[PDB]
Amino acid sequence: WTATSGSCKGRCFELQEVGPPDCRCDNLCKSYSSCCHDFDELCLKTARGWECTKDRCGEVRNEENACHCSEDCLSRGDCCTNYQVVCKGESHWVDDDCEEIKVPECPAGFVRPPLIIFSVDGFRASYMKKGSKVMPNIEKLRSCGTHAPYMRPVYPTKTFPNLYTLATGLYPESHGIVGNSMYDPVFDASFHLRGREKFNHRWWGGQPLWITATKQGVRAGTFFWSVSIPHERRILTILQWLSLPDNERPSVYAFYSEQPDFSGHKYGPFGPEMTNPLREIDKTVGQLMDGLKQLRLHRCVNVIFVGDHGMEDVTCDRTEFLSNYLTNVDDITLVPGTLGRIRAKSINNSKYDPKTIIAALTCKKPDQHFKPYMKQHLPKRLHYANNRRIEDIHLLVDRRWHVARKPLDVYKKCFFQGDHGFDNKVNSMQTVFVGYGPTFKYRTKVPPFENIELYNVMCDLLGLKPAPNNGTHGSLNHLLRTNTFRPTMPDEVSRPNYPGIMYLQSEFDLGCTCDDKVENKLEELNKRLHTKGSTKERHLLYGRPAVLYRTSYDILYHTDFESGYSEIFLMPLWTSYTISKQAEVSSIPEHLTNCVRPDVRVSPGFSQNCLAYKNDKQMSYGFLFPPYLSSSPEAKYDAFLVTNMVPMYPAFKRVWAYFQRVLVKKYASERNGVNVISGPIFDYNYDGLRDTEDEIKQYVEGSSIPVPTHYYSIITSCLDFTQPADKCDGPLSVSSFILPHRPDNDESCNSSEDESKWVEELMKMHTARVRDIEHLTGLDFYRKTSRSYSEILTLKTYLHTYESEIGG
Ligand SMILES: *[C@@H]1O[C@H](CO)[C@@H](O[C@@H]2O[C@H](CO)[C@@H](O[C@@H]3O[C@H](CO[C@H]4O[C@H](CO)[C@@H](O)[C@H](O[C@H]5O[C@H](CO)[C@@H](O)[C@H](O)[C@@H]5O[C@H]5O[C@H](CO)[C@@H](O)[C@H](O)[C@@H]5O)[C@@H]4O)[C@@H](O)[C@H](O[C@H]4O[C@H](CO)[C@@H](O)[C@H](O)[C@@H]4O[C@H]4O[C@H](CO)[C@@H](O)[C@H](O)[C@@H]4O)[C@@H]3O)[C@H](O)[C@H]2NC(C)=O)[C@H](O)[C@H]1NC(C)=O
Numbered sequence: 079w080t081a082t083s084g085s086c087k088g089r090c091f092e093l094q095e096v097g098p099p100d101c102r103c104d105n106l107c108k109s110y111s112s113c114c115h116d117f118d119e120l121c122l123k124t125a126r127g128w129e130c131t132k133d134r135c136g137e138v139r140n141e142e143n144a145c146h147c148s149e150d151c152l153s154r155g156d157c158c159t160n161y162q163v164v165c166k167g168e169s170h171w172v173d174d175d176c177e178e179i180k181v182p183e184c185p186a187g188f189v190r191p192p193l194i195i196f197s198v199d200g201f202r203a204s205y206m207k208k209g210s211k212v213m214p215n216i217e218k219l220r221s222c223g224t225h226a227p228y229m230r231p232v233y234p235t236k237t238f239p240n241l242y243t244l245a246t247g248l249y250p251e252s253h254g255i256v257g258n259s260m261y262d263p264v265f266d267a268s269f270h271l272r273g274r275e276k277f278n279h280r281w282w283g284g285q286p287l288w289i290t291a292t293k294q295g296v297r298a299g300t301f302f303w304s305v306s307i308p309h310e311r312r313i314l315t316i317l318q319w320l321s322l323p324d325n326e327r328p329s330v331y332a333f334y335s336e337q338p339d340f341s342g343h344k345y346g347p348f349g350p351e352m353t354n355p356l357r358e359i360d361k362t363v364g365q366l367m368d369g370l371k372q373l374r375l376h377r378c379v380n381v382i383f384v385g386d387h388g389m390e391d392v393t394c395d396r397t398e399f400l401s402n403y404l405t406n407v408d409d410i411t412l413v414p415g416t417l418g419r420i421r422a423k424s425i426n427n428s429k430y431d432p433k434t435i436i437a438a439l440t441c442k443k444p445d446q447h448f449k450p451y452m453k454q455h456l457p458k459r460l461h462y463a464n465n466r467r468i469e470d471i472h473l474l475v476d477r478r479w480h481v482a483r484k485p486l487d488v489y490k491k492c493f494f495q496g497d498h499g500f501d502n503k504v505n506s507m508q509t510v511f512v513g514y515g516p517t518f519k520y521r522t523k524v525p526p527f528e529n530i531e532l533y534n535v536m537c538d539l540l541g542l543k544p545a546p547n548n549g550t551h552g553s554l555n556h557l558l559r560t561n562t563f564r565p566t567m568p569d570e571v572s573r574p575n576y577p578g579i580m581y582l583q584s585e586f587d588l589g590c591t592c593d594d595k596v597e598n599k600l601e602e603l604n605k606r607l608h609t610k611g612s613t614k615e616r617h618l619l620y621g622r623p624a625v626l627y628r629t630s631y632d633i634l635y636h637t638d639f640e641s642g643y644s645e646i647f648l649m650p651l652w653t654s655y656t657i658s659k660q661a662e663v664s665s666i667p668e669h670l671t672n673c674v675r676p677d678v679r680v681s682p683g684f685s686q687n688c689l690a691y692k693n694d695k696q697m698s699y700g701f702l703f704p705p706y707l708s709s710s711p712e713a714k715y716d717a718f719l720v721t722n723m724v725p726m727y728p729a730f731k732r733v734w735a736y737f738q739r740v741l742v743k744k745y746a747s748e749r750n751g752v753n754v755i756s757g758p759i760f761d762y763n764y765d766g767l768r769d770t771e772d773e774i775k776q777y778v779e780g781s782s783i784p785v786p787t788h789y790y791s792i793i794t795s796c797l798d799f800t801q802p803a804d805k806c807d808g809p810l811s812v813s814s815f816i817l818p819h820r821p822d823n824d825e826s827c828n829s830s831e832d833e834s835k836w837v838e839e840l841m842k843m844h845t846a847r848v849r850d851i852e853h854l855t856g857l858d859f860y861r862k863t864s865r866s867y868s869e870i871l872t873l874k875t876y877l878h879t880y881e882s883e884i885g886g
């Protein structure tokens with residue numbers, strides 16, 4: 079209950095929220111039904127519209143006007159945005175040439191360039207090119223400022239998860255907003271779009287920019303705008319705030335447009351009805367820049383024009399129903415649409431079983447338009463698992479489709495022609511980023527980047543220290559003229575041992591055999607050199623990875639590869655090797671098929687054993703450096719050392735063998751040599767972070783050999799591929815993956831076919847950033863290159879997406 083008897087008289091859009099129940103006059107009062115009786119009358123004036131006309135010039139101030147064209151309006155800070163154009167013969171901002179903004183040109187008493195975030199809902203990246211004829215103001219921001227061809231949103235590509243990721247720098251799994259609709263089983267509470275539950279603070283985790291700014295003494299305008307406040311009034315309110323006295327005036331502001339998303343849902347992303355909403359957005363940008371120009375702020379403010387996600391063509395006919403798959407359809411709750419999330423309808427149902435729900439949903443129809451996953455098996459690049467609000471069973475829905483529980487849900491709850499929410503690597507879900515202002519670069523294009531990185535830069539723009547977040551601070555320094563953040567590489571925590579030969583063959587009792595007893599300081603001085611690091615510069619191109627946690631490990635050198643071998647996990651953390659364009663693929667000789675060899679540098683006590691693998695009927699083993707790529711028959715024996723072996727399910731060995739035997743050489747051919755770093759990942763609590771030894775849930779039977787949940791590889795070459803990967807003088811090019819180590823290939827519906835028809839598609843789906851691997855392994859890569867550290871941070875956040883080029 080609000081006592082709405084006070085007045086908004088001189089308090090319209092006041093910046094401090096007054097507490098219940100004195101009545102409110104802010105942009106949130108509508109939402110709370112708490113506005114004073116006279117809010118509409120005083121604060122939402124509309125009389126005469128939004129533009130000055132010639133006859134209004136010099137007019138006597140009438141306070142009933144929505145905005146003013148009288149003489150004192152500039153200093154009251156409430157002229158119509160077109161005032162100086164119509165009444166003082168100025169030009170519109172968009173008609174002015176652009177002129178580099180080398181330094182902030184701010185009125186006296188500004189302590190820093192203000193930041194205005196202009197966010198547009200559903201603005202698909204390709205609208206920048208496709209609607210460019212109708213968006214002159216936006217086009218000028220983009221061509222004169224700093225722009226990316228697109229900005230990658232987070233998954234799911236829904237509105238609240240992405241705006242709040244923009245505000246926090248966090249994955250939805252960490253900030254808590256994991257969908258537009260949620261159930262938190264600890265609170266036993268549901269979050270919905272329609273309602274009041276959603277303002278409750280416990281939903282909203284992390285620290286959004288307005289809080290970061292406030293705690294560090296920088297004032298913020300309101301980030302939230304009520305749907306019914308027109309855009310023109312939002313712009314006028316921001317401009318009026320920008321006229322407040324120094325001590326009251328915020329330094330950071332946000333504007334939010336419901337368009338073009340709102341029309342895109344009804345008409346599809348390129349519906350003919352979409353031109354008008356894009357024109358209208360542009361006219362709004364124009365009104366903002368004209369207003370800044372009248373305030374002498376158009377070369378002072380940094381403006382970010384940013385979207386939350388794109389829009390895809392989706393219609394009612396393209397809906398999959400779970401009632402076509404499950405016999406038990408009424409025992410589940412589905413969160414439906416462009417993603418699916420499934421849990422039991424009642425926790426009292428002891429007959430509920432996820433494994434049979436998943437099996438019933440797996441590769442059941444030839445053309446099935448969704449794929450089920452337990453959340454821990456989703457591609458690690460989605461970072462969508464570590465939150466009790468995310469249901470264990472997830473459905474990744476194909477672009478252009480929906481999932482629903484039953485047909486009745488769709489026709490008794492087409493309505494719509496656009497939607498979003500799909501996998502955040504999908505081209506239609508990509509959105510926009512333009513930065514313009516003194517602090518951004520002039521006429522500069524930057525490569526695509528992810529929206530989790532912006533928070534850090536918004537902090538940089540405002541002189542704020544960012545709260546702990548998922549951006550990689552420094553990876554976007556190339557967008558900025560000044561205020562760059564110059565990080566130092568993290569310090570290596572554990573230093574390696576460099577073991578020499580210390581054990582005899584007969585000290586090992588590993589149950590391993592190898593056909594290797596047929597074997598001149600010619601090729602004997604030579605093999606000692608190799609074991610001491612002599613080819614190390616060929617195979618370790620960017621320095622050894624640093625270990626950022628406390629552990630005990632050994633560096634092992636070989637002719638064809640180098641590894642960091644963990645005495646704690648009994649297998650390498652990393653194995654590094656270079657394959658030139660000219661390298662040749664060989665087969666394992668018949669006599670060597672089952673050969674495993676003890677490594678006389680590493681104690682039996684810190685070695686795996688073949689017995690454990692014999693006894694474990696589920697688990698087999700693979701090798702990290704592949705025997706097929708050995709440089710010579712003699713070198714091949716090194717690839718069978720017990721210290722290069724790793725546990726692998728037979729089903730996964732099909733995937734790994736095709737990668738090692740076919741794809742590595744294929745990449746070396748295409749990229750002019752590659753350097754590969756591969757290793758194991760252990761993430762049994764699915765938090766995207768390396769597991770300690772006591773988190774490991776599965777061991778090779780009867781042994782202490784931990785089973786990885788994933789295997790990674792990072793494949794680096796020269797960005798200028800006329801130079802070979804081992805002699806590259808400039809920027810690097812990388813692609814990486816984090817493959818899940820699963821005992822079946824159920825994820826791949828074509829898996830009974832030859833690996834040539836399905837393994838590469840699987841790998842593409844599990845593409846990753848090098849930074850993702852760093853979190854998961856506690857390693858830091860690329861420590862010794864000839865590149866700037868910021869450029870290396872950018873390379874580590876790179877995601878190879880495999881989508882075709884954005885456009886047509
Ligand atoms: C992306 O970036 C983010 C941000 O940097 C990374 O997330 C951080 O990861 C850290 C490691 O997981 C984690 O640190 C922990 O902090 C605990 C205190 O946490 C509270 O305080 C902070 C600070 O204000 C706050 O941010 C937290 O907010 C979380 O929880 C609230 C309420 O649920 C949410 O509103 C909010 O959205 C956020 O949720 C997310 O994080 C939590 C984990 O905290 C998840 O459970 C959620 O699903 C969601 O993902 C908190 O309010 C601190 O208590 C922890 O210390 C324990 O563990 C260590 C183990 O060594 C030990 O030393 C301690 O003694 C303690 O152990 C005891 O508790 C154990 C577990 O209960 C118990 O088993 C033991 O026996 C012990 O008794 C820990 O240090 C940090 O909170 C999050 N921060 C955020 C914002 O998410 C994220 O990792 C990055 N992602 C990637 C891939 O890089």
Ligand SMILES: O=C(OCc1ccc(OC(F)(F)F)cc1)N1C[C@@H]2CN(C(=O)c3ccc4[nH]nnc4c3)C[C@H]2C1
Nearest residue numbers: 195197199237241244245287301302303332333334339
């Ligand atoms: O006023 C707002 O914006 C604050 C802001 C700005 C920049 C921000 O970014 C940053 F912090 F970085 F500046 C953060 C918050 N908002 C955002 C909210 C969206 N919404 C929906 O009902 C909704 C909308 C579109 C959908 N499509 N499909 N389902 C949908 C559901 C209410 C709106 C009010």
Ligand SMILES: [Ca+2]
Nearest residue numbers: 691694697698
């Ligand atoms: Ca076995």
Ligand SMILES: [Ca+2]
Nearest residue numbers: 761767768769
């Ligand atoms: Ca983990």
Ligand SMILES: [Cl-]
Nearest residue numbers: 236257258259
């Ligand atoms: Cl959702």
Ligand SMILES: [Cl-]
Nearest residue numbers: 729822823829
């Ligand atoms: Cl299989």
Ligand SMILES: [Cl-]
Nearest residue numbers: 629769770771
């Ligand atoms: Cl550990």
Ligand SMILES: [Cl-]
Nearest residue numbers: 204505884885
């Ligand atoms: Cl596109």
Ligand code: NA
Nearest residue numbers: 823824826829
């Ligand atoms: Na399969």
Ligand SMILES: [Zn+2]
Nearest residue numbers: 200237339343
């Ligand atoms: Zn939408």
